[PDB]
Amino acid sequence: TQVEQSPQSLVVRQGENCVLQCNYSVTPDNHLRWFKQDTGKGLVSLTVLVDQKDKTSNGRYSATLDKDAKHSTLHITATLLDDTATYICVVGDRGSALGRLHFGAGTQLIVIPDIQNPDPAVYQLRDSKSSDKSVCLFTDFDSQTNVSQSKDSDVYITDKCVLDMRSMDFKSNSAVAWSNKDFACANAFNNSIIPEDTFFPS
Amino acid sequence: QKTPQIQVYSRHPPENGKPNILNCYVTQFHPPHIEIQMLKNGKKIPKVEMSDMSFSKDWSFYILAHTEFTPTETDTYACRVKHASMAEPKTVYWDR
Amino acid sequence: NYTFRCLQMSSFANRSWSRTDSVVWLGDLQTHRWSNDSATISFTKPWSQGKLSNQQWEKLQHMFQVYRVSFTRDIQELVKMMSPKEDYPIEIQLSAGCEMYPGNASESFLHVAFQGKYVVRFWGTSWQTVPGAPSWLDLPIKVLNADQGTSATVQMLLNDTCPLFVRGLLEAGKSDLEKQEKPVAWLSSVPRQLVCHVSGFYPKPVWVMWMRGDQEQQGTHRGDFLPNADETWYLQATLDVEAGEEAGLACRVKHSSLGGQDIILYW
Amino acid sequence: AAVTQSPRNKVAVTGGKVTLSCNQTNNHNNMYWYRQDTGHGLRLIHYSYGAGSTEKGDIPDGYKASRPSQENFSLILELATPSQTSVYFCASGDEGYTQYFGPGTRLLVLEDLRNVTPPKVSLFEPSKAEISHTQKATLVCLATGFYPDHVELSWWVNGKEVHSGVCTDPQPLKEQPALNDSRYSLSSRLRVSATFWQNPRNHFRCQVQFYGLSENDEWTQDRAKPVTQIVSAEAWGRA
Ligand SMILES: CCCCCCCCCCCCCC[C@@H](O)[C@@H](O)[C@H](/C=C/[C@H]1O[C@H](CO)[C@H](O)[C@H](O)[C@H]1O)NC(=O)CCCCCCCc1ccccc1
Ligand SMILES: *[C@@H]1O[C@H](CO)[C@@H](O[C@@H]2O[C@H](CO)[C@@H](O)[C@H](O)[C@H]2NC(C)=O)[C@H](O)[C@H]1NC(C)=O
Ligand SMILES: *[C@@H]1O[C@H](CO)[C@@H](O[C@@H]2O[C@H](CO)[C@@H](O)[C@H](O)[C@H]2NC(C)=O)[C@H](O)[C@H]1NC(C)=O
Ligand SMILES: *[C@@H]1O[C@H](CO)[C@@H](O)[C@H](O)[C@H]1NC(C)=O
């Protein structure tokens, strides 16, 4: 492990900037490259720095290399939700196929989505093929709201998840609860600190 | 594989009983791995000096081995060289 | 007209064992040694550092230190890249330097030999193969030329650094280069070929001829220049003669160390 | 410069035999096999400089590799072990330094395949409350009772996959946390405009691809053989 990344992980609010660090001891150090890796996905190259004192930029991404210091930084300007990814630092020890790549273990980024007009509610949704079975859906709330797992082991609750209705420029949080075993939507998310203005219909 | 040429000779004129320097000088060999001994009466002289290996414009390796000696009408002086390009070690005796 | 040489020799025995040794010459006097065991290059004269500063030199050495390690793994990789087409033991030599002319003119070179035969040179701005080279070498050449860093560095050393350094080396070591050493001659014969042993002379230009008074003997057979540990030259001249004609014949020697007073020794 | 891998996801058993395959049509001489593991960067297992050559990398133990031709490079686990559970990347490249990476392959090595079970999928239709209240319609999908956790869930509207207004849980939850080999559940959401849902010509479908047993795996048990399959639920928009 001649490639060391820092911070290990970090959390930011959408629209803020962040800086990521890479320090390495690999000798020689022909070039250094930054990769973006989405959860489950593969490795997209963002930039490659080559000179003794180097600067590159690719969109909102920019990077610097200083070979004397054997140190690199990646700057992300105006983070978006899609920036949620692991960033990986790679140093190659030759300028040909004779080289070996030296991988850092990456830095984990989470961008927190900017919720404009929150409108928390709990809806009930029914099975299409078997209308008796159903689920309760906490949705449209802001990020200051956390969602706790369930008190009962026979009740299930997923973690917050954000969706982007791209073409309408609209984002919304959501969690889903279900049980088989005396389970109704108003009693579903008791164990969670929910806003006092949460809409419950019918 | 190039096969070695050995040349033994002295630094100063040879006068019996007077200290001097003997020169073993091997050349035109390949590959550069070689064993070289300088011998007084077929016995190996201990502290023999070796120059650094190098090669000519034609790529052939050469090396100089040397030792202090005191020639006498009685004693024989030789140079044994073991090398890949020979099955039998080659010995060359000093001749005045 | 002096020629400066850096000489490298690396042997790769098998997939894991190897070594690399080097030596450096200005004309016929040795300036540097770099053993495989040694982590740093060594001076073999007092003036080996030429007109370079301590900082300047220490930079230059570090570059090479890295080079040696890189070069080892690279050759090894380039084998994998051929095999089974290529196979151990492998022997590589490089000869590089610059040759000095009147004024400021010089011409640099980098010449590589694979398994005893000259195959690759650096010319212009990239590696190329020379005539006679086995074709498979094109692939390595292509990889070597892929590496722009290296190319840059090599053009620099060859174009700029070498000459500049030699121009400086030539000043700082002029005393030793222009040093004059006087030849010592003796005679003998073997069953009759007569021998005129000449030893201890520097520089190497020398004129050794057999004489019958003034009659320049044409049967004189000159040998090869052999070295002496103290960095002086030894040579010998043999004459094939009939029994009896020993008395009278003499060896005459022309050398710059004498200055008009020619060595002349009679049998 | 494309690099493809097959399979993209694989379940195998201790002592079994796995083949990971990489295809490149770039005419690249050089190909490399790596494995990614958390708290580690990519480490090199094997590489190859051309057809009929393979070279040991940094962590070659337990893997063997094969380069039948310029286009294909294979990683072979002969006696699979749980420790070889990882994501495997393949890459290629020419005389330059750049290496081009494939999309990855997840491998899971289990002790026994006796617990493997495909999911049951269910699609819950939007709330008319939501529609009035928000002018929007959230459909929810729910995959349940499956093991292991190797699934890909997608949303398809009218035979064409959608991405916008979708979100799936990052990790699937355990159904019986108490039990050692718990089966899993996973949930997802697709959100459209009310007008879009109200259209009875709009066909909505939640697809779960499940990875399990090959056709070549043995199965003794009574219940249906848990092969790799797609399991989905569907619904029609209504006004
Ligand atoms: C199968 C055998 C093939 C035979 C052909 C061999 C011909 C040429 C063999 C030697 C030529 C030099 C190889 C240089 C090579 O190893 C590079 O890989 C190496 C490292 C390069 C990296 O790191 C660098 C560090 O700065 C740099 O960032 C590069 O961009 C990167 O790719 N190059 C060097 O380290 C440069 C050193 C200059 C070479 C000078 C050697 C000349 C010489 C040396 C000793 C004696 C005589 C001559
Ligand atoms: C020539 O030089 C190298 C380095 O000086 C030697 O290889 C190294 O050996 C040391 C000690 O045995 C190890 O710590 C290193 O792992 C080796 N270095 C590398 C880069 O692998 C090499 O053995 C020397 N040649 C001989 C004949 O001994
Ligand atoms: C170093 O010297 C070489 C040796 O001639 C120069 O080579 C020329 O490079 C130019 C421009 O890059 C080309 O137009 C020619 O093809 C080259 N000439 C020959 C004879 O090869 C080289 O440019 C010099 N470079 C530096 C950086 O000093
Ligand atoms: C490599 O060669 C050396 C000496 O020439 C020998 O001692 C060593 O065992 C060899 N290695 C192998 C793996 O054959």
Judged by DSSP in three states, D128 sits in helix
Rounded to an integer, what distance in angstroms lies between the CA atom of residue A146 and that of residue A127? 27
Domain boundaries, chain D: 1-111, 112-239
Cβ neighbours of residue C244 closer than 8 Å, sequence gap 6 or more: none
- CB count within 10 Å of CB C146 equals 18
Cβ < 6 A, ligand 3 pocket? C 124-125, 155, 159
Rounded to an integer, what distance in angstroms lies between the CA atom of residue B95 and that of residue D168? 95
What tokens were used for C238? 């043999």
| Cβ pair A34, A63 in contact under 8 A | yes
The letter for the amino acid at D141 is: C
Contact call for C80 and D49, based on CB within 8 A: yes
> CA-nearest residue of chain B to C24?
B54
DSSP strand pairing (B5-10 vs B20-29): antiparallel
The letter for the amino acid at D130 is: E
Looking at the CA of C12, name the nearest ligand.
4
Judged by DSSP in three states, D118 sits in coil
Q: How far apart are the first and last CA of chain C?
A: 38
Measured CA distances, C168 to C27, C53, C153, C176, D76 (Å): 15, 11, 21, 14, 60
Contact call for C149 and A30, based on CB within 8 A: yes
Q: What angle do CA C69, C74, C80 make, to 5 degrees?
A: 140
- Long-range own/partner contacts, residues A141-144 (CB < 8 A, 24 or more apart): A141/A115, A141/A173, A141/A194, A141/A195, A141/A198, A142/A115, A142/A118, A142/A173, A143/A112, A143/A113, A143/A115, A143/A173
Rounded to an integer, what distance in angstroms lies between the CA atom of residue A100 and that of residue C28? 41
**Whose CA is closest to D117, among D233, D8, D224?**
D224
Strand order across the beta sheet in which C117-123 lies? C42-43, C29-34, C18-26, C4-12, C90-100, C106-114, C117-123, C126-129
Query: How much distance in Å is there from the Cα of C85 to the middle of ligand 4?
Result: 21
Judged by DSSP in three states, A186 sits in helix
Contact call for D95 and C81, based on CB within 8 A: no
Q: Which residue has the tokens 């996905």?
A: A41
| Cβ pair B10, B66 in contact under 8 A | no
Domain boundaries, chain C: 1-178, 179-267
C16 touches chain D (CB under 8 A): no
> CA-nearest residue of chain C to D47?
C80
Enumerate the residues of chain A whose CB falls inside 8 A of the CB of residue C143: 96-98
| Cβ pair C79, C93 in contact under 8 A | no
Q: Which residue has the tokens 């480490």?
A: D43
Contact call for D97 and A127, based on CB within 8 A: no
Ligand 2 within 6 A of CB of C19: yes
| Cβ pair A187, A138 in contact under 8 A | no
For the CA of C14, the closest atom of ligand 4 is: 1
Q: What angle do CA D112, D114, D115 make, to 5 degrees?
A: 105
Among candidates D41, D138, D193 on the partner chain, residue whose Cβ is nearest the Cβ of A104: D41
The letter for the amino acid at D146 is: F
Binding-site annotation: residue ranges of C: 74, 147-150
Rounded to an integer, what distance in angstroms lies between the CA atom of residue D140 and that of residue D146? 18
For the CA of C66, the closest atom of ligand 1 is: 35
Ligand 2 within 6 A of CB of C66: no
**Whose CA is closest to A162, among A115, A121, A126, A94?**
A115
Q: Quick one: A14 and A107 in the same domain?
A: yes
D27 touches chain C (CB under 8 A): no
Q: Quick one: A145 and A202 in the same domain?
A: yes
| Cβ pair C261, C232 in contact under 8 A | no
Rounded to an integer, what distance in angstroms lies between the CA atom of residue C67 and that of residue C22? 13
- Number of structural domains (chain B) is 1
C179 burial level (CB within 10 Å; 0-12, 13-18, 19+): middle
Measured CA distances, A119 to A195, A200, C59 (Å): 10, 11, 66
> CA-nearest residue of chain B to C28?
B56
Judged by DSSP in three states, D198 sits in helix
Enumerate the residues of chain A whose CB falls inside 8 A of the CB of residue D96: 96-97
Rg, Å, chain B Cα set: 14
Cβ neighbours of residue B38 closer than 8 Å, sequence gap 6 or more: B22, B24, B44, B45, B48, B65, B67, B77, B78, B79
* CATH topology for the D1-111 domain: Immunoglobulin-like (2.60.40)
> What residues does C236 pair with on adjacent strands?
C197
What tokens were used for C84? 């089974």
**In sequence order, which ranges of chain D are alpha helices (DSSP H)?**
128-134, 194-198
Ligand 1 within 6 A of CB of C75: yes
Contact call for A156 and D235, based on CB within 8 A: no
D51 touches chain C (CB under 8 A): no
| Cβ pair C236, C193 in contact under 8 A | no
Contact call for C226 and B7, based on CB within 8 A: yes
**Whose CA is closest to B79, among B68, B91, B65?**
B91
What tokens were used for C21? 């040794």
Q: What angle do CA A43, A35, A41 make, to 5 degrees?
A: 25
Question: Which experimental approach was used here?
Answer: X-ray
Report the CATH number at residue A188.
Answer: 2.60.40.10
Rounded to an integer, what distance in angstroms lies between the CA atom of residue D16 and that of residue D62? 13
Largest pairwise CA distance in chain B:
41
Residue B2 is given by DSSP the state B
Sign of dihedral through CA atoms D96, D97, D100, D105? positive
CA B95 to chain CA centroid, Å, is 13
> CA-nearest residue of chain C to A28?
C66
**In sequence order, which ranges of D85-224 are alpha helices (DSSP H)?**
128-134, 194-198
Q: What angle do CA D182, D184, D187 make, to 5 degrees?
A: 160
The protein residue whose alpha carbon is closest to atom 36 in ligand 1 is C150
Rounded to an integer, what distance in angstroms lies between the CA atom of residue B54 and that of residue B50? 12
Rounded to an integer, what distance in angstroms lies between the CA atom of residue B10 and that of residue B25? 11
Per-residue HEC secondary structure of chain C comes to CCEEEEEEEEEECCCCCEEEEEEEEECCEEEEEECCCCCCCEECCCCCCCCCCHHHHHHHHHHHHHHHHHHHHHHHHHHHCCCCCCCCCEEEEEEEEEEECCCCCEEEEEEEEECCEEEEEEECCEEEECCCCCHHHHHHHHHHHHCHHHHHHHHHHHHHHHHHHHHHHHHHCHHHHCCCECCEEEEEEECCEEEEEEEEEECCCCEEEEEECCEECCCEEECCCEEECCCEEEEEEEEECCCCCCCCCEEEEECCCCCCCCEEEEC
Residue span of the structural domain in which A196 resides: 114-202
Resolution in Å equals 3.1
- Domain at C1-178, CATH class: alpha beta
| Cβ pair B91, B79 in contact under 8 A | yes
**Whose CA is closest to A117, among C171, D135, D138, D237?**
D135
B79 burial level (CB within 10 Å; 0-12, 13-18, 19+): buried
Residue span of the structural domain in which B46 resides: 1-96
- CB count within 10 Å of CB C17 equals 10
Measured CA distances, C209 to A139, C206, C259 (Å): 110, 10, 17
C-alpha distance from D89 to closest chain C C-alpha (Å): 22
What tokens were used for B74? 């009685």
What tokens were used for D202? 């709009």
User: D159: number of CA atoms within 13 Å, CB side?
Assistant: 1
The protein residue whose alpha carbon is closest to atom 15 in ligand 3 is C124
The letter for the amino acid at A27 is: T
DSSP strand pairing (D105-110 vs A155-157): unpaired
- Number of structural domains (chain A) is 2
Rounded to an integer, what distance in angstroms lies between the CA atom of residue D8 and that of residue D24? 15
**Whose CA is closest to C165, among C31, C258, C15, C12?**
C31
- CB count within 10 Å of CB B1 equals 10
| Cβ pair D35, D86 in contact under 8 A | yes
C-alpha distance from D150 to closest chain A C-alpha (Å): 11
C-alpha distance from C1 to closest chain D C-alpha (Å): 41
- Domain at C179-267, CATH class: mainly beta
Rounded to an integer, what distance in angstroms lies between the CA atom of residue D4 and that of residue C173? 64
Cβ neighbours of residue A173 closer than 8 Å, sequence gap 6 or more: A113, A115, A139, A140, A141, A142, A143, A145, A160, A161, A162
Judged by DSSP in three states, D216 sits in coil
C-alpha distance from A39 to closest chain C C-alpha (Å): 34
C183 burial level (CB within 10 Å; 0-12, 13-18, 19+): buried
The architecture of the domain spanning D112-239 is: Sandwich (2.60)
Task: Please give the backbone phi and psi of residue D147, each rounded to the nearest 5 degrees, phi first.
Answer: -155, 130
Rounded to an integer, what distance in angstroms lies between the CA atom of residue D119 and that of residue A164? 27
What tokens were used for C241? 């003669």
| Cβ pair A134, A184 in contact under 8 A | no
Report the CATH number at residue B5.
Answer: 2.60.40.10
Contact call for B53 and C118, based on CB within 8 A: no
DSSP strand pairing (D72-77 vs D18-24): antiparallel
